[PDB]
Every structure is written in C-alpha cells, then in structure tokens.
Amino acid sequence: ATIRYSVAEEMESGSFVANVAKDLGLEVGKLAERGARLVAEGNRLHFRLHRKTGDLFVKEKLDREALCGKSDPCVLHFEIILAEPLQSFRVEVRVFDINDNAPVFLNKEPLLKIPESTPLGSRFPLQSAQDLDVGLNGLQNYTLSANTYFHLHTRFRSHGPKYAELVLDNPLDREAQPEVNLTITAVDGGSPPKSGTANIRVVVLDVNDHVPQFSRLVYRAQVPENSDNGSLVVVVTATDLDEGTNKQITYSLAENPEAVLRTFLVDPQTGEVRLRGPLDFEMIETYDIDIQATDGGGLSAHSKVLVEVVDVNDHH
Ligand SMILES: *[C@@H]1O[C@H](CO[C@@H]2O[C@@H](C)[C@@H](O)[C@@H](O)[C@@H]2O)[C@@H](O[C@@H]2O[C@H](CO)[C@@H](O[C@@H]3O[C@H](CO)[C@@H](O)[C@H](O)[C@@H]3O)[C@H](O)[C@H]2NC(C)=O)[C@H](O)[C@H]1NC(C)=O
Ligand SMILES: *[C@@H]1O[C@H](CO[C@@H]2O[C@@H](C)[C@@H](O)[C@@H](O)[C@@H]2O)[C@@H](O[C@@H]2O[C@H](CO)[C@@H](O[C@@H]3O[C@H](CO)[C@@H](O)[C@H](O)[C@@H]3O)[C@H](O)[C@H]2NC(C)=O)[C@H](O)[C@H]1NC(C)=O
Ligand SMILES: *[C@@H]1O[C@H](CO[C@@H]2O[C@@H](C)[C@@H](O)[C@@H](O)[C@@H]2O)[C@@H](O[C@@H]2O[C@H](CO)[C@@H](O[C@@H]3O[C@H](CO)[C@@H](O)[C@H](O)[C@@H]3O)[C@H](O)[C@H]2NC(C)=O)[C@H](O)[C@H]1NC(C)=O
Ligand SMILES: [Ca+2]
Ligand SMILES: [Ca+2]
Ligand SMILES: [Ca+2]
Ligand SMILES: [Ca+2]
Ligand SMILES: [Ca+2]
Ligand SMILES: [Ca+2]
C-alpha cells in the first residue's frame, strides 16, 4: 500500500537514500519515460529524485531535533507521481535519531543558599537539564561531585529522570566552611554517553549559634584613689565567631550594687571600663563588677573585673 525507507539523521545533503525503481514495481527506463515526479505539500520539499537513474537523494542536512522535535518517530511523507498510466505512490522516510546533542543546564551557575541551622536529612530540589535527543540518546542519569556534606538522590519517572535533589548527610557548620561548591553532572545513555555539567554554589547563612566569649574570666585592676574622673580602669574584649548583626558586641553594667553603678561606667563599644565617680580607700577597699557582653541576637556572657583601690587617703 505504502512504501517506506529509513535514513540517518544529520547526514550531508545530496547523499543517497534509496533506489525507487526496485520497490516501485517498475524499471529505471520506465521511471525516465513515465515522467517520475516528486510531489508533496507545499511546505516540505526534503528530497530529490533523479529520473534517469531512479536515484533518491536527500536535498538538505536533516536535523531531527528541528523537524520532529521531541517526537519518537520522525517521519517525512511525500508522493511519487507518474503518468500514462497516472499512478500515485505514498512514500515515507523515517529519520533515525543519533546522539549529537549533549545535556545542558540553563543556569551554569545556580545559587542555592542554605541556612546553617538546617535539619540533617533535608532535601533541596535542583533544576533539570535538557537533552534535545529522544530515547536512550536522551537524559538517563545524574551524578554529584565528591563531597563531605551531601549525596545526590535522583527522582526517576518511567520514561526518564524527573529531576535531581541534594540530600544533606552532615550538619552544616558555617564556621568551618561558609560555602560549599559542587558540580552536578547530567549524563545520557548513548554510546558513548555525553555529559553536561553545572556548578552549584551553596552559601551557608550565618546563625547566631555562638555565644560571645570574654578574654579573661577575671580582670585584675589596681586603681589609685587620687585618680581623675573618666580615668581608664581596664579594657575588656569579647569575641564572636559569627557574622552580620549576630557578631557586634554590646557591653553593659547589669545587676550590680549601688556603689558600683555609682562610681563606674563601661563603654558599650570599645569596652572601656572607666570611672564616673570619686574614690576613697577608707570607704571602699575593693569593688567586684560583673559586666555583660550582649550579642545582637541576644546571647549574653558575663565576666567580673576585680578592682582594688590602692594607697591610704592622702598618704602621698
Ligand atoms: C545512576 O548513577 C548512579 C551512580 O553513578 C554510577 O555509579 C558510579 C559508581 C559510576 O560508575 C558512574 O559512572 C555511574 O554513572 C547509580 O547508582 C550507583 O550504582 C553503583 C553501581 O556500581 C553502586 O555501586 C557502589 O559503589 C560504591 C563504591 O564504588 C560502594 O561503596 C557501594 O557499596 C556500591 O557498591 C552505587 O551504590 C549506586 N549509588 C550511588 C549513589 O553511587 C545508579 O544505579 C544509576 N542509575 C541508572 C538508572 O543508570
Ligand atoms: C566550583 O568548583 C568547580 C569545580 O572544580 C572541580 O571540581 C572539584 C571537585 C575538583 O575535581 C577540582 O579538581 C575541579 O577543578 C570549579 O570549577 C573549576 O574552575 C577552574 C578555574 O575556574 C578550572 O581550572 C582548570 O585548570 C586546568 C589546569 O589549570 C585547565 O586546563 C582548565 O581549562 C581549567 O582552567 C576547573 O577545570 C574547573 N572545574 C570544573 C569541573 O569545571 C569552580 O571554579 C568553583 N567555583 C567557585 C566559585 O568556587
Ligand atoms: C564624671 O564623669 C561622669 C561621666 O562623664 C561622661 O563620660 C565622659 C567620657 C564624657 O563623655 C562626658 O561628657 C560624660 O558626661 C559624669 O556623669 C555624667 O554627667 C552628665 C552631666 O551631669 C550627665 O549628662 C546628663 O545629665 C542630665 C542630668 O539630669 C541627664 O538628665 C541627661 O540625660 C544626661 O545624662 C551624664 O548622664 C552623667 N553620666 C554619664 C555616664 O555620662 C559626672 O558628672 C562627672 N563628675 C562627677 C563628679 O562624677
Ligand atoms: Ca541534531
Ligand atoms: Ca539527534
Ligand atoms: Ca544525548
Ligand atoms: Ca555553628
Ligand atoms: Ca553561625
Ligand atoms: Ca553570637
């Protein structure tokens, strides 16, 4: 009823396809004589017939991804018309698929920002790739680069892979490495398989999971009673391994006896523990002051400075 042939994709134009006279029920001379003409719909003119030889050539480089797109059978139809007697013959040439397209990502550099306090076992979806081929020549599998935090889990469908997702195996600690960088690899199933890699940048968001720590737990100080107002008792420092607003330190005098808050002050920024009142050895020999370093998130830490006034009042 209908005659068909098979051709390979992306072969050079003018290349041979088949010989018509054989499977037409005629001979070459008959083809030349009966006026063998190729006719199809106006839009498609993919082939060419040489009458005198009965030879079928392809007129253009056939690109299957353009003609059929994502369709499994790529078939081109056209009819051979004759004359005396006037016969019409339906011909269909199938364009086989080859592996001339590798998988690719639209974002070669995706940006995935994961908070530091992320529960172990959490999953992060990744955008799939695009292999324009069909079947085994299309997408088949994903792989993840060597890593100490993640492992890749590829959600599959019946025909092909749905998409891939990162699964966290280890607790993310920003203080260790604030960023982890990876390369996802998309692999088809052709022979040889073709690959397409993308580069994921995983940024770890700082969480206030670090209380400020004072240098010394106890600050020893020996201050002369005849010292002036605003004289520097001591300088205290507090460190925070975090970043952002969860790092800046706010020093403060809190929960102290009246005398302390009456004769002492502290600089909220620098840590300048200084005087705001007079001193007399006979009245108060020693002060013990608990200062408080407060973090932006609210994590506070205490430390006591033990001041001891020196020299009898007006001894020298
Ligand atoms: C999709 O691909 C994954 C992993 O990728 C494949 O396996 C690698 C080892 C390489 O050979 C890649 O070229 C290849 O694409 C497949 O899952 C994995 O299959 C392998 C089969 O050998 C399993 O072997 C393991 O090997 C390690 C050490 O090499 C051992 O510690 C394991 O105990 C085990 O023997 C592996 O467990 C398995 N999973 C992972 C995460 O690698 C997957 O089968 C494939 N799917 C399809 C449909 O192709
Ligand atoms: C994110 O990480 C990628 C991955 O780096 C690669 O993966 C690791 C797991 C290891 O296997 C590394 O050995 C491997 O490079 C980085 O991509 C890499 O970029 C560099 C330069 O930007 C590329 O360097 C090469 O150097 C050789 C010899 O010097 C040249 O011949 C190459 O032409 C190339 O210049 C490296 O090839 C490339 N790796 C891959 C797989 O593409 C990426 O830089 C990094 N990004 C960030 C922001 O950290
Ligand atoms: C000894 O010094 C303290 C503190 O001096 C302060 O710190 C220095 C580094 C400089 O920056 C000074 O400019 C700064 O004042 C003195 O205590 C402070 O006195 C001033 C003025 O009396 C107070 O300012 C105001 O006081 C009025 C009074 O009603 C309030 O209403 C205002 O709100 C405003 O606070 C200031 O509060 C007070 N305390 C501090 C911690 O600065 C002190 O007067 C001086 N002399 C003696 C004898 O102690
Ligand atoms: Ca192609
Ligand atoms: Ca193809
Ligand atoms: Ca392919
Ligand atoms: Ca931490
Ligand atoms: Ca942190
Ligand atoms: Ca902190």
Pocket residues: Cβ below 6 A from ligand 2:
145-146, 181, 183, 199, 201
The bound ligand whose nearest atom lies closest to the alpha carbon of 150 is: 1
φ and ψ at residue 24, rounded to 5 degrees: -110, -20
Determined by X-ray
Q: What is the 3-state secondary structure (H, E, C) of the chain?
A: CCEEEEEECCCCCCCEEEECCHHHCCCHHHHHHCCCEEECCCCCCCEEEECCCCEEEECCCCCHHHHCCCCCCCEEEEEEECCCCCCEEEEEEEEECCCCCCCECCCCCCEEEEECCCCCCCEEEECCCECCCCHHHCEEEEEECCCCCEEEEEEECCCCEEEEEEEECCCCCCCCCCEEEEEEEEEECCCCCCEEEEEEEEEEECCCCCCCEECCCEEEEEEECCCCCCCEEEECCEECCCCCCCCCCEEEECCCCHHHHHHEEECCCCCEEEECCCCCCCCCCEEEEEEEEECCCCCEEEEEEEEEEECCCCCC
Q: Is 211 within 8 Å of 298 (Cβ atoms)?
A: no
**Alpha-carbon gap, residue 8 to 14, rounded angstroms:** 13
Domains 1-98 and 207-316 share a fold: yes
**PDB resolution in Å:** 3.3
Q: How many CB atoms lie within 10 A of CB 144?
A: 19
Q: Is 254 within 8 Å of 290 (Cβ atoms)?
A: yes
Residue 208 known to bind ligand: yes
Write the CATH number of the domain with boundaries 1-98: 2.60.40.60
Strands 111-115 and 195-205: parallel
**Alpha-carbon gap, residue 199 to 183, rounded angstroms:** 4
Write the CATH number of the domain with boundaries 99-206: 2.60.40.60
CA of 241 to the centre of ligand 9 (A): 7
CA of 257 to the centre of ligand 3 (A): 19
The distance from CA 286 to its chain's CA centroid, rounded to whole angstroms, is 60
**Alpha-carbon gap, residue 185 to 125, rounded angstroms:** 15
Q: Which two tokens stand for residue 224?
A: 């002369």
Best probe residue, ligand 2, of 107, 177, 181, 197 (max atoms within 8 Å of C-beta): 181
Looking at domain 207-316, its CATH class is mainly beta
Residue 290 known to bind ligand: no
At 116, the amino acid letter reads: E
The distance from CA 172 to its chain's CA centroid, rounded to whole angstroms, is 16
Residue 137 known to bind ligand: yes
CA of 222 to the centre of ligand 3 (A): 24
The ranges assigned to domains in the chain are 1-98, 99-206, 207-316
Instruction: Name residues with Cβ closer than 5 Å to ligand 8, which is an ion.
Output: 174, 206-207, 209, 242
Is ligand 1 within 6 A of the CB of residue 141? yes
User: Where does residue 283 rank: exposed (0-12), middle (13-18), buried (19+ CB within 10 A)?
Assistant: exposed
> Of all protein residues, whose CA lies closest to atom 6 belonging to ligand 1?
143
In whole angstroms, how far apart are CA 17 and each of 22, 49, 291? 13, 10, 91
Is ligand 1 within 6 A of the CB of residue 143? yes
**Alpha-carbon gap, residue 100 to 194, rounded angstroms:** 9
**Alpha-carbon gap, residue 175 to 241, rounded angstroms:** 7
Distance between start and end Cα atoms, the chain: 127
**Alpha-carbon gap, residue 206 to 240, rounded angstroms:** 12
